[PDB]
Amino acid sequence: SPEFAAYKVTLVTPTGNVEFQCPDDVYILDAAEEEGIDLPYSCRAGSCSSCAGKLKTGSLNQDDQSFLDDDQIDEGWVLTCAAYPVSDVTIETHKEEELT
Template identity: 45%
Template sequence: MDQVLYSSYIIKIPVISRISPSQAQLTTRLNNKTYFGLSSSRGNFGKVFAKESRKVKLISPEGEEQEIEGNEDCCILESAENAGLELPYSCRSGTCGTCCGKLVSGKVDQSLGSFLEEEQIQKGYILTCIALPLEDCVVYTHKQSDLI
């Protein structure tokens, strides 16, 4: 069901009962809209462009490797779930550390998180529930015990 907000413009906003970190980052402005990794702007006359795909290799504690597709608008945890993989998580907002992994190569944006200390980030620790891959990555999963 849509909810209508009244102002000088009428904007319909879908009511979302459960919002993921990637959905929380969605922005809406009159002339520039971004929805679920697709963007459109007035200057492009309604053309829709898909975000560039990133390869994320996940390595379990047992050494099992799984490669998934992701993009800079979808966190690693959500991309893994979409591919049918199960990773540990709890808060889904970067505040608990349950989903901790260690970035071996590549680059991620995890600016939404507040749990990791700067020293841990410098050592390569990431929170998969908020980490957005900016390039192809390799991540060791299940690293919560390293933070203790």
């Protein structure tokens, strides 16, 4: 497997869709911000609802998140501040209200 890689992230946001390359060692949130995208957050530590999204295709590593339970992870919930892509992914953002 490659020492380093980047994956195509498609974010489906309330103001439109955007795509960018995310390094496999950068969280979705941080990579979005580098591209000038404003995404919701507060704690940036994987322990709250602020940065919630829904995974629509592809795979994430969310080992660094703790607030979502195993059923919520199975349902496709994502804490964008604590998730790394391991494939190209599509995430629908700004989902805190739906999650909670």
